[PDB]
Amino acid sequence: QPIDADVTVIGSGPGGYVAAIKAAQLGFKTVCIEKNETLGGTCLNVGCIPSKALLNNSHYYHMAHGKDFASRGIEMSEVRLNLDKMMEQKSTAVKALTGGIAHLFKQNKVVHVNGYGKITGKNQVTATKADGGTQVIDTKNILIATGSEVTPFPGITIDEDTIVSSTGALSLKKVPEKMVVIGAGVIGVELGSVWQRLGADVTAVEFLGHVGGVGIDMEISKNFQRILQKQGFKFKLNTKVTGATKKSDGKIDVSIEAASGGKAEVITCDVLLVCIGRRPFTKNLGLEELGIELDPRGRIPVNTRFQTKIPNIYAIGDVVAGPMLAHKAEDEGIICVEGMAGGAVHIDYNCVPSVIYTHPEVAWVGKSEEQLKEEGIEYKVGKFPFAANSRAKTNADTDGMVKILGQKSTDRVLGAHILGPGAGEMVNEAALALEYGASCEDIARVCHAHPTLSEAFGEANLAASFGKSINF
Amino acid sequence: VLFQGPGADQPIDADVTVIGSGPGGYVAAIKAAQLGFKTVCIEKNETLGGTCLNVGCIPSKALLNNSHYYHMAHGKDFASRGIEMSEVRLNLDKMMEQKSTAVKALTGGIAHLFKQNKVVHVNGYGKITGKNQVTATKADGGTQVIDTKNILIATGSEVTPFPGITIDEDTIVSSTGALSLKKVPEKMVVIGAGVIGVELGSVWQRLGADVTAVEFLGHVGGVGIDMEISKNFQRILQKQGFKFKLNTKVTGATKKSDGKIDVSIEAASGGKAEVITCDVLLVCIGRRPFTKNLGLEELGIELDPRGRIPVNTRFQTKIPNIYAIGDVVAGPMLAHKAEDEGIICVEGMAGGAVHIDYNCVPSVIYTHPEVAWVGKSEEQLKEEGIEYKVGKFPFAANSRAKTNADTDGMVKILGQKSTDRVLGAHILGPGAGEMVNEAALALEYGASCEDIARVCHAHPTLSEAFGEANLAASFGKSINF
Numbered sequence: 001q002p003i004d005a006d007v008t009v010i011g012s013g014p015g016g017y018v019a020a021i022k023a024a025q026l027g028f029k030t031v032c033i034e035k036n037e038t039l040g041g042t043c044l045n046v047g048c049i050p051s052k053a054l055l056n057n058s059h060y061y062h063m064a065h066g067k068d069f070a071s072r073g074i075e076m077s078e079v080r081l082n083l084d085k086m087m088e089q090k091s092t093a094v095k096a097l098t099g100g101i102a103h104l105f106k107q108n109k110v111v112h113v114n115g116y117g118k119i120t121g122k123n124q125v126t127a128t129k130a131d132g133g134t135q136v137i138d139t140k141n142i143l144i145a146t147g148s149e150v151t152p153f154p155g156i157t158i159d160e161d162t163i164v165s166s167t168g169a170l171s172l173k174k175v176p177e178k179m180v181v182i183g184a185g186v187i188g189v190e191l192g193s194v195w196q197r198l199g200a201d202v203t204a205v206e207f208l209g210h211v212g213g214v215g216i217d218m219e220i221s222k223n224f225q226r227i228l229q230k231q232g233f234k235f236k237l238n239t240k241v242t243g244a245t246k247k248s249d250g251k252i253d254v255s256i257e258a259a260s261g262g263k264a265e266v267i268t269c270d271v272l273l274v275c276i277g278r279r280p281f282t283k284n285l286g287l288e289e290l291g292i293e294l295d296p297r298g299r300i301p302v303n304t305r306f307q308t309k310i311p312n313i314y315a316i317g318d319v320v321a322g323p324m325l326a327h328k329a330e331d332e333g334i335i336c337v338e339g340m341a342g343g344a345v346h347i348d349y350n351c352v353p354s355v356i357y358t359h360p361e362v363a364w365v366g367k368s369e370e371q372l373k374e375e376g377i378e379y380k381v382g383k384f385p386f387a388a389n390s391r392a393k394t395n396a397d398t399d400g401m402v403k404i405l406g407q408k409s410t411d412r413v414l415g416a417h418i419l420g421p422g423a424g425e426m427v428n429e430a431a432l433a434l435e436y437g438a439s440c441e442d443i444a445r446v447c448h449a450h451p452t453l454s455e456a457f458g459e460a461n462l463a464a465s466f467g468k469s470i471n472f
Numbered sequence: 473v474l475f476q477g478p479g480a481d482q483p484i485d486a487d488v489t490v491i492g493s494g495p496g497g498y499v500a501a502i503k504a505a506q507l508g509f510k511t512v513c514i515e516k517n518e519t520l521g522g523t524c525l526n527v528g529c530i531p532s533k534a535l536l537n538n539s540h541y542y543h544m545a546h547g548k549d550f551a552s553r554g555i556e557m558s559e560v561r562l563n564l565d566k567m568m569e570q571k572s573t574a575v576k577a578l579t580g581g582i583a584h585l586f587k588q589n590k591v592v593h594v595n596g597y598g599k600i601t602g603k604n605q606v607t608a609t610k611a612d613g614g615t616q617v618i619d620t621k622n623i624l625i626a627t628g629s630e631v632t633p634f635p636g637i638t639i640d641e642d643t644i645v646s647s648t649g650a651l652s653l654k655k656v657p658e659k660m661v662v663i664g665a666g667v668i669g670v671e672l673g674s675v676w677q678r679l680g681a682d683v684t685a686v687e688f689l690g691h692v693g694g695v696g697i698d699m700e701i702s703k704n705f706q707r708i709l710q711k712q713g714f715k716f717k718l719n720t721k722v723t724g725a726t727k728k729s730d731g732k733i734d735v736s737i738e739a740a741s742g743g744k745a746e747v748i749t750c751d752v753l754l755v756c757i758g759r760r761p762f763t764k765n766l767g768l769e770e771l772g773i774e775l776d777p778r779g780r781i782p783v784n785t786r787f788q789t790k791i792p793n794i795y796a797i798g799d800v801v802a803g804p805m806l807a808h809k810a811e812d813e814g815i816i817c818v819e820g821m822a823g824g825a826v827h828i829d830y831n832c833v834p835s836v837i838y839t840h841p842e843v844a845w846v847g848k849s850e851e852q853l854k855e856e857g858i859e860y861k862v863g864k865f866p867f868a869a870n871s872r873a874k875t876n877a878d879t880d881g882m883v884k885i886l887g888q889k890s891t892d893r894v895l896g897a898h899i900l901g902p903g904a905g906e907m908v909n910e911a912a913l914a915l916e917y918g919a920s921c922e923d924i925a926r927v928c929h930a931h932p933t934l935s936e937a938f939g940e941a942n943l944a945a946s947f948g949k950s951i952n953f
């Protein structure tokens with residue numbers, strides 16, 4: 001009863017499910033193994049999709065319940081939250097998209113095996129199903145796309161009841177009166193903002209001195225934090241958590257101290273969200289028996305074709321180095337299978353954008369000011385505020401700015417940083433610009449439609465190239 | 473002094489005198505000053521910013537934004553997200569106030585920018601009175617002479633009148649009256665299903681009006697819209713409740729004793745006479761270049777048959793120090809088009825090269841769903857004999873659109889059959905207006921469909937549908953559809 005395959009993909013997240021589809025489209029007989037009940041991995045089931053749904057719904061709740069809609073002549077007597085219904089909208093979107101992947105596998109002739117995959121030979125994967133039955137796949141190539149898991153906080157046990165990971169935080173059954181978030185990175189600020197909008201008293205505690213995670217430009221990060229604080233989101237930066245105690249009355253006492261030492265205090269909350277990071281997941285995959293060693297951070301080392309040291313066994317996505325993002329994993333999956341078919345394999349991590357889907361949004365691609373300074377690059381700066389952009393002003397939504405970093409000698413765009421309305425979509429024009437090696441002048445001379453937020457991207461590039469914008 | 477209004481009548485000298493302060497003129501004036509020219513801008517109206525800021529793009533987009541949110545709240549959308557409201561009521565006065573506040577802030581912004589850049593603002597009616605002379609006539613009857621090396625005509629456009637139907641901005645309105653109606657009309661008829669008419673019709677439809685647009689041609693959305701896009705757009709608007717009578721001519725309109733208006737219509741080719749009644753009639757059959765009392769005849773600058781000023785690739789008229797840009801010359805009558813022409817024109821005066829590729833100028837319709845396009849339509853490629861291939865991706869398969877439950881429409885990419893060069897991009901759906909600028913950048917470089925497919929578009933974003941449609945055009949198949 002074995003299956004024969006050309007390519008066997010272990011995991012169905014952004015990296016694995018896309019790699020499987022593309023491999024089949026290139027003519028490979030393709031199998032995808034997934035241990036969970038649905039396809040789509042972390043992103044679809046407990047990640048990007050449910051978080052963005054709650055961000056959208058909670059933003060609209062805020063617009064209706066607060067001052068915004070009234071200022072536009074949209075008058076409502078009472079605005080009430082129905083959290084069960086809001087969570088239902090989230091779940092409906094997840095179900096539709098997970099079913100969509102199942103259909104795409106059928107359309108492209110990808111064979112779906114439900115079980116826990118273990119590599120049992122250089123050319124063999126064995127999937128064990130929940131009832132113990134096994135399915136053997138004899139296969140020319142193996143693609144490891146096993147993804148990531150939450151990084152635990154030493155001494156604090158997540159139970160998804162009162163101490164939750166992002167998974168528990170996405171499905172709380174009531175708005176907590178008080179919530180503490182450990183970690184002010186992208187995930188923590190997004191989920192904190194959701195619950196703050198819905199009525200919770202929210203504080204994020206962070207060991208470092210800025211919000212938004214690794215690689216965010218410092219000026220952008222400081223201005224972003226100030227805007228979030230005015231919304232009501234509180235922060236304790238430069239602060240260490242030493243422990244948390246689950247109490248008999250169901251609450252949580254969190255012990256904190258200054259990151260540099262001293263200033264010990266205890267803060268109490270109803271829900272504690274632990275979101276200090278994520279890490280590669282390779283458990284019980286068979287790597288030790290094959291001799292595939294991990295790097296000190298748990299990633300699988302791979303070459304430029306994504307081959308492990310065993311050259312017909314590959315790895316992509318959150319299980320290898322680089323930014324732990326869905327579009328990064330997807331592109332690695334595509335190029336890996338194109339390489340298996342003999343083609344070129346290229347991804348430029350400097351051209352991979354990052355987005356924070358708060359309101360205002362934050363998005364960036366390329367290098368920050370801090371990175372350019374460390375590399376000794378001589379650069380110039382152009383800035384344009386959304387308060388001077390016609391679409392933002394017409395919409396009465398004017399927080400933030402576009403900041404462009406350009407090379408002095410050549411006018412090359414080195415980095416683009418956006419805080420404000422539409423940042424998440426706008427960064428993709430910037431990603432194209434970086435991929436093409438655009439100059440600041442090039443972008444300034446695009447005939448951006450009027451009135452659009454994109455005009456602020458043009459104006460910031462004009463300031464960097466010529467020295468002055470038109471409208472500021 | 474940087475403001476020369478009534479009572480300020482001493483002769484001025486200038487390097488560049490710009491007539492008009494719309495998107496083309498005010499941007500040209502700022503850029504000219506930044507390039508080192510002593511610059512004057514003459515404007516006859518009480519505020520700066522022209523048609524776009526005062527009675528055009530800005531007030532229309534404000535009402536489109538606000539009426540969309542009214543629809544989300546009053547209809548099914550917010551309830552589907554768990555946002556429960558007892559009553560949702562329209563306060564039209566407050567909605568119009570938000571619009572007016574935005575316009576006032578932006579018009580004041582231009583005044584500040586002129587001051588910051590040392591542009592001299594002359595408030596008056598400019599007339600060219602010699603090859604190097606403009607005379608401004610002010611509200612008090614005073615005159616002021618400007619001796620100037622170069623003249624830049626940026627006098628813009630006006631509404632095209634409809635013979636026999638008198639716009640009074642009461643019950644028979646232009647776009648200006650339609651932007652300031654004092655109550656939601658029970659029934660509205662729109663003459664003209666171009667961009668302006670469809671936008672303003674949709675505003676009032678969302679706010680409660682029964683709206684019908686009557687159009688002589690066979691499609692909605694104006695010149696150059698791709699026909700497949702136009703047909704799919706019309707069907708979506710019809711499902712929203714916006715009615716259309718295409719291939720139909722208006723023969724007249726009568727204001728009646730009960731205060732309503734009877735509009736007489738017929739098939740464009742003849743016959744099928746009918747009368748439709750409305751409370752408000754919006755006349756929006758087009759706009760046309762405005763050059764009244766500018767002095768062109770005395771200078772010998774003749775107009776083309778449509779009223780435009782002929783210019784060369786440097787925007788020079790037949791008199792080589794007199795230039796013209798924007799809605800007063802040929803090309804798409806759009807704000808960003810006028811702005812770009814103004815910038816490159818004054819850069820040329822300063823000695824630079826002058827080049828604009830109109831195939832890279834985008835068009836946007838700010839309905840919901842939005843429509844946006846740049847480059848060539850299928851009809852254009854067929855008429856030019858260009859061999860092309862098609863890639864399409866529906867927003868129903870995009871993760872951001874589906875998560876937001878906002879899934880109308882598609883991205884359509886046209887690529888050259890042999891070379892994979894992007895020839896045109898057409899977007900119907902959420903976020904089209906911002907997304908089309910990624911396409912405009914690609915066209916500036918002569919990028920291929922493959923080039924775009926390989927950009928690492930963020931997940932989840934609407935832009936991924938643009939990537940997927942390019943992948944379908946290049947490789948033959950997308951990932952997610």
Ligand SMILES: Cc1cc2nc3c(=O)[nH]c(=O)nc-3n(C[C@H](O)[C@H](O)[C@H](O)COP(=O)(O)OP(=O)(O)OC[C@H]3O[C@@H](n4cnc5c(N)ncnc54)[C@H](O)[C@@H]3O)c2cc1C
Binds near residue numbers: 146325327
């Ligand atoms: C709350 C949250 C929000 C996020 N938001 C965003 C966002 O907005 N944008 C963004 O770009 N990224 C976001 N991310 C990150 C994104 O989810 C990941 O970068 C992405 O999912 C990684 O894809 P992957 O295919 O490499 O792995 P995963 O998505 O982790 O998929 C791995 C899959 O393999 C399965 N698996 C593992 N081992 C085996 C085995 N032995 N046998 C069978 N199956 C196995 C797992 O069950 C899983 O389905 C978010 C993450 C979280 C937690």
Ligand SMILES: Cc1cc2nc3c(=O)[nH]c(=O)nc-3n(C[C@H](O)[C@H](O)[C@H](O)COP(=O)(O)OP(=O)(O)OC[C@H]3O[C@@H](n4cnc5c(N)ncnc54)[C@H](O)[C@@H]3O)c2cc1C
Binds near residue numbers: 493522628
């Ligand atoms: C309802 C509506 C909505 C629109 N929406 C959009 C949109 O979303 N996007 C878009 O790109 N375009 C849009 N447009 C079109 C846009 O407004 C025009 O394309 C643009 O304003 C043209 O700019 P301009 O500088 O050439 O002329 P104008 O904006 O018309 O400005 C000309 C100026 O010159 C002044 N003037 C004229 N003659 C003289 C004189 N002799 N002396 C002194 N001053 C003089 C006028 O008073 C006026 O202020 C819209 C138009 C309308 C009517």
